[PDB]
Design a protein around this ligand. Structure first.
Ligand SMILES: CCCCCCCCCCCCCCCCCC(=O)OC[C@H](COP(=O)([O-])O)OC(=O)CCCCCCCCCCCCCCCCC
Ligand SMILES: CCCCCCCCCCCCCCCCCC(=O)OC[C@H](COP(=O)([O-])O)OC(=O)CCCCCCCCCCCCCCCCC
Ligand SMILES: CCOc1ccccc1-n1c([C@H](C)N2CCN(C(=O)COc3ccc(Cl)cc3)CC2)nc2ccccc2c1=O
Ligand SMILES: *[C@@H]1O[C@H](CO)[C@@H](O[C@@H]2O[C@H](CO)[C@@H](O)[C@H](O)[C@H]2NC(C)=O)[C@H](O)[C@H]1NC(C)=O
Ligand SMILES: *[C@@H]1O[C@H](CO)[C@@H](O[C@@H]2O[C@H](CO)[C@@H](O)[C@H](O)[C@H]2NC(C)=O)[C@H](O)[C@H]1NC(C)=O
Ligand SMILES: *[C@@H]1O[C@H](CO)[C@@H](O[C@@H]2O[C@H](CO)[C@@H](O)[C@H](O)[C@H]2NC(C)=O)[C@H](O)[C@H]1NC(C)=O
Ligand SMILES: *[C@@H]1O[C@H](CO)[C@@H](O[C@@H]2O[C@H](CO)[C@@H](O)[C@H](O)[C@H]2NC(C)=O)[C@H](O)[C@H]1NC(C)=O
Lengths: 468, 453
């Protein structure tokens, strides 16, 4: 190796200094070329859309608890016993809680009944405060029903209309001070001048705070009777019996959902089958998984009744009220006619079966509340086979979802010729599978979307990522 | 003295491994609990290995580095393959991991809640590396006072996460650790992968190079300072994972690519662009600890027979090591434009913990089969035995884990031995070779203007 003094007299020459100035400039030009290329690949990047800053009732399902006595059992039907079930409710990952009318009401006299004073057969104001604080601890919102005559036939006191309208105005200002998160009124087709009162109540509810709710509930199955209630309101969640009339063919239900979404103009809605009934009172026992897949994947808030996760039937059990059946927590819930229950007819017997109905509820209720393209993604159905209903959810660049349902007892193939969807989320060639309603398919096995053969009463939850 | 000792160890041992690691620790374990046990087991394992290097490097008293600890307990080519596998595996893949984190964390104020192209990352990391190397090829005097400021930057980057992670802890008692030891149903064949991700969080002690009479009262100062200023890091590193888990569930953390920005994006205050700046400065502080401690390693290896004398030559004015930069740069760029973090951690960690396990086993072999060569202090016989046993078992089991990324390190350290007899045990096999290689050294010594001084 060369030493010090033999180096400076060779590396001071012309030529040797020009080649190293040339190499130095070449290295620096390669560096600035990499910098400029990184800048041009940053700029030529596709934009990204802005998240809508949703409310809380957009993010999950609501769980209607109409009759509180038959929810735990007789004698244990107080508000204190309800605090032991909120862990089970958070296991369902419901976001809200529509409690029944807990106020005091005797009968058709309006002067005795009052929407301010709690009935003593349910609990105390201190216990209601403890319920609200423990629910705010678990982040479960509590919505209080306020139908006046909830023990009777005509729930809205059909003699007069003025005092029953004024007392609700006192009722909304009272309970919101206590810290409830919404309200529900039912059977408003039996309330005269309804769309005028609902706008005032909606004003007061939005006038306390912005994170408060009002749910109105009819029984009218007519579309034009529904849109007339939504003339002066946008923030109103209206639950009706619009989906419960039929649906034996898939073309009818497809036309129903797309016609509703076309008529309201792609706004936020609430998908339910009733106002106070279960799913089993309107469907046979095989279609419960299909409708629970459909109601969780539609653009809006799903509202379920209590017991709809376990397939709570009242017609498959002895003497009961058909509007308020008993809840089957264990193998010993139903006291009389012993031996009538079974292993699959209860909560804890379905809390261990992987191919159960409650497991499907828990697998859908977290995919609804966690995934981004089912929260506020777009909606586009398309034509498919004669008997199917297929649609796609996609938000911006997130995981695209594809749901294919078979509303018939026939063996059909899919035949998905898209040809009309936007260019962002057109159909891929091959996509995965998250779950199916029936056993006989493995989860995570990608299919190609051509020979999709469906057994009767099957529904799928395929998904695929954003590509081009 | 004592306080400057715990200061220099706390400055070299913390860094930006706490932002890279906890996603790979959770992925190769199950729940929160097994992850937190891994994060506290790796702390005491690093304490044991640091104590072993401190007890081993003051019994040999040579010119530093565990290249000269494998030599003089094994002599020949065991110590040649270390300095081969160093510049061929460990150092390029070490720079090409902190740089990949650095480039990720500065594109975050431009891609807020959206996806980043990978070729946007790689051509920014490949700007930061070269700026580091150009800063190192100029004066060292600026290169140390920059480092000091980046040390205080990495301290504040730890602190502005550890403060709002306990204000969420004693408030409401927000807990999602419930079911702590309930994992994702199995992790046994990818256990050592977590060992590869935890130990990388504590890396740095094996460049400390303890020499005996430089600290005041050195019979007791070194192990005391190491055991204090390692358990301090273990405390500060387990509470930060607690602070990460107190606001993020164990399933948001597997789908996220930067946990320090999703910690800040839900703990706002209208300057949450602070933490992608400070995590970047902590990633830059580890990049700046680059060509140094490779340079003196090249100086020691070039003094006998390995690594030809063009290396460890020094620029005439501005006396800085240039050919170490020249030999390091097109290797780390090749490994950078190749595969991702999960390949590079495995590919470096195989060889790195294999050779540290060999050296700490050689400590025992020198302790028993040569009972002379006195000890200024000793450790119990179980400490380096346990450290070497865990190291070699995890490295051996890591071949049943992903072997197309670690088996290339094994085939490189097994082509170490066909590169030894060709270049050390031989005498000028052609004359077409020496006269060719002389003009190589002459021409690039003339171009770089480097002397051995
Ligand atoms: C996939 C993993 C990621 C990518 C990794 C890519 C790795 C590519 C292989 C790189 C091999 C580099 C080996 C250099 C080792 C030098 C060892 C050494 O000490 O040489 C001493 C020898 C005598 O020097 P002196 O003591 O007389 O001054 O001085 C000399 O020997 C001078 C020659 C120095 C250069 C040695 C070249 C060795 C060639 C190895 C074959 C593979 C590349 C072949 C390329 C052929 C293109 C023409
Ligand atoms: C697909 C395309 C592939 C293109 C090649 C890709 C590989 C790129 C390799 C880059 C090597 C790293 C470059 C670091 C540059 C050193 C930083 C620097 O500017 O040093 C300052 C030094 C002194 O300046 P001054 O006092 O003379 O003004 O100024 C000087 O000392 C000037 C001389 C140093 C110039 C450095 C340029 C590259 C040196 C080449 C040396 C011989 C190459 C041998 C093979 C190495 C590559 C395998
Ligand atoms: C980041 C590690 O290096 C440092 C640590 C503290 C302060 C400064 C540095 N520093 C140093 C200093 C001069 N040093 C040299 C190496 N040093 C050891 O190798 C440990 O020496 C020991 C001394 C006492 C004990 Cl008890 C154990 C080991 C320690 C001191 N040069 C640098 C050069 C280029 C870039 C950065 C640095 C740099 O940051
Ligand atoms: C309540 O809705 C009304 C119209 O639907 C809006 O304006 C209020 O109208 C009532 C009379 O019906 C007045 O007494 C109020 O003073 C009006 N509010 C104003 C002027 O702010 C309005 O959108 C809603 N009111 C509020 C206060 O938000
Ligand atoms: C919704 O509920 C009402 C109550 O049973 C049904 O009947 C109406 O009842 C009111 C007074 O109770 C009468 O004034 C109406 O004339 C009744 N309607 C009819 C068609 O007879 C009503 O039918 C229910 N709606 C549906 C679609 O079932
Ligand atoms: C239902 O959707 C169709 C498109 O699927 C739209 O129909 C349009 O209606 C307006 C007004 O009647 C016409 O001027 C357009 O020519 C129609 N377009 C098509 C393609 O038919 C509309 O969004 C919805 N229709 C109604 C009546 O609300
Ligand atoms: C719980 O499981 C039993 C056993 O499979 C079900 O009983 C069967 O029900 C089907 C249709 O309901 C009948 O065709 C079988 O003949 C029954 N077999 C026996 C052995 O009972 C029972 O119906 C299930 N319960 C529910 C609610 O689905």
């Amino acid at each position: 190796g060369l030493s010090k003094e033999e180096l400076l007299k060779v590396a001071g020459s012309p030529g040797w200094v020009r080649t190293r100035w040339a190499l130095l400039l070449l290295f620096w030009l390669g560096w600035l070329g990499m910098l400029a290329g990184a800048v041009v690949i940053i700029v030529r990047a596709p934009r990204c859309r802005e998240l809508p800053a949703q409310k809380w009732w957009h993010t999950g399902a609501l769980y209607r608890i109409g009759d509180l006595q038959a929810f735990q059992g007789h004698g244990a039907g107080n508000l204190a016993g309800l605090k032991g079930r909120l862990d089970y409710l958070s296991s369902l990952k419901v976001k809200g809680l529509v409690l029944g009318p807990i106020h005091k009401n005797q009968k058709d006299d309006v002067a005795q009944t009052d929407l301010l004073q709690i009935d003593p057969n349910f609990g105390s104001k201190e216990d209601f405060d403890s319920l609200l604080q423990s629910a705010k601890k678990k982040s479960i919102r509590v919505i209080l029903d306020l139908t006046p005559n909830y023990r009777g036939e005509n729930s809205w006191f059909s003699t007069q209309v003025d005092t029953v309208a004024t007392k609700v105005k006192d009722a909304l200002e009272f309970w919101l001070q206590a810290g409830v998160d919404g309200f529900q009124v039912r059977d408003i087709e039996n309330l005269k001048d309804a769309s005028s009162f609902l706008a005032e109540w909606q004003n007061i509810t939005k006038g306390f705070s912005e994170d408060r709710l009002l749910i109105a509930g009819t029984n009218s199955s007519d579309l034009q009777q529904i849109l007339s209630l939504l003339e002066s309101n946008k923030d109103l969640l209206l639950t009706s019996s619009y989906l419960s009339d039929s649906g034996s063919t898939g073309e009818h239900t497809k036309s129903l959902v797309t016609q509703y979404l076309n008529a309201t103009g792609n706004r936020w809605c609430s998908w339910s089958l009733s106002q106070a009934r279960l799913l089993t009172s309107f469907l046979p026992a095989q279609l419960l998984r299909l409708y629970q897949l459909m109601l969780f994947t539609l653009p809006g808030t799903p509202v379920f009744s209590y017991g709809d996760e376990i397939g709570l039937d009242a017609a498959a059990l002895p003497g009961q009220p058909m509007e308020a059946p008993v809840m089957l927590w264990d193998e010993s819930s139903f006291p009389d006619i012993p031996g009538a229950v079974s292993a699959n007819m209860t909560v804890k017997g379905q809390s261990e079966d992987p191919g159960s109905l409650l497991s499907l509820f828990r697998r859908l209720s977290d995919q609804r509340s966690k995934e981004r393209s089912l929260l506020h993604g777009d909606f586009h159905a398309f034509s498919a086979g004669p008997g199917l209903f297929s649609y796609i959810r996609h938000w911006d660049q997130n995981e695209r979802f594809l749901v294919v349902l078979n509303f018939g007892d026939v063996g059909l193939s899919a035949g998905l010729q898209a040809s009309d969807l936007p260019a962002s989320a057109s159909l891929p060639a091959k996509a995965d599978l998250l779950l199916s309603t029936q056993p006989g398919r493995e989860e995570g096995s990608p299919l190609e979307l051509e020979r999709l053969k469906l057994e009767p009463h099957e529904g799928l939850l395929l998904r695929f990522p954003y590509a081009a | 003295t004592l306080l400057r000792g715990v200061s220099i160890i706390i400055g070299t041992i913390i860094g930006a491994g706490i932002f890279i690691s906890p996603k790979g620790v959770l992925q190769n374990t199950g729940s929160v609990g097994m992850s937190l046990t891994i994060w506290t087991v790796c702390g005491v394992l690093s304490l044991f290995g640091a104590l072993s290097y401190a007890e081993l490097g003051t019994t040999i008293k040579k010119s530093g580095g565990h290249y000269t600890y494998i030599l003089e307990v094994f002599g020949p080519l065991p110590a040649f393959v270390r300095v081969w596998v160093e510049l061929l595996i460990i150092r390029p893949a070490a720079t090409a991991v902190i740089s990949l984190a650095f480039g990720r964390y500065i594109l975050e104020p431009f891609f807020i809640q959206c996806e980043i192209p990978e070729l946007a990352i790689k051509l920014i990391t490949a700007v930061g590396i070269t700026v580091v190397m150009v800063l190192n090829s100029m004066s060292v005097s600026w290169s140390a006072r920059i480092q000091i400021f980046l040390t205080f930057c990495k301290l504040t980057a730890i602190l502005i996460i550890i403060v709002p992670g306990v204000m969420q802890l004693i408030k409401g008692q927000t807990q999602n650790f419930k079911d702590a030891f309930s994992g994702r149903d199995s992790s046994i064949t990818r256990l050592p992968l977590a060992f590869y991700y935890g130990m990388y969080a504590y890396a740095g002690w094996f460049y400390l190079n303890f020499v005996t009479e430089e600290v005041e009262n050195p019979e007791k100062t070194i192990p005391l300072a190491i055991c204090i200023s390692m358990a301090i890091v273990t405390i500060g590193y387990v509470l930060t994972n607690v602070a990460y888990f107190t606001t993020i569930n164990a399933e948001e953390l597997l789908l996220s690519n930067a946990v320090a920005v999703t910690f800040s994006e839900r703990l706002l205050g209208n300057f949450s662009l602070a933490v992608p700046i400070f995590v970047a400065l902590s990633c830059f502080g580890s990049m700046n600890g680059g060509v140094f401690a490779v340079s003196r390693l090249f100086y020691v290896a070039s003094r006998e027979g390995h690594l030809p004398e063009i290396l460890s030559m020094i620029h005439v004015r501005k006396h800085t090591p240039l050919p170490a930069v020249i030999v390091l740069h097109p290797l780390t760029m090749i490994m950078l434009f190749s595969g991702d973090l999960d390949s590079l951690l495995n590919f470096l960690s195989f060889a790195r913990w294999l050779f540290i396990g060999l050296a700490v086993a050689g400590l025992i072999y020198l302790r028993y089969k040569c009972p002379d060569m006195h000890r200024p202090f000793k450790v119990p016989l179980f400490i380096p035995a346990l450290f070497s046993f865990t190291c070699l078992f995890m490295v051996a089991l890591s071949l049943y884990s992903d072997p197309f990324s670690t088996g290339i390190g094994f085939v490189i350290t097994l082509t170490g031995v066909p590169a030894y007899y060709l270049f050390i045990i031989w005498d000028k096999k052609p004359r077409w070779f020496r006269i060719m290689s002389e003009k190589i050294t002459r021409t690039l010594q003339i171009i770089l203007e480097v002397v051995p001084e």
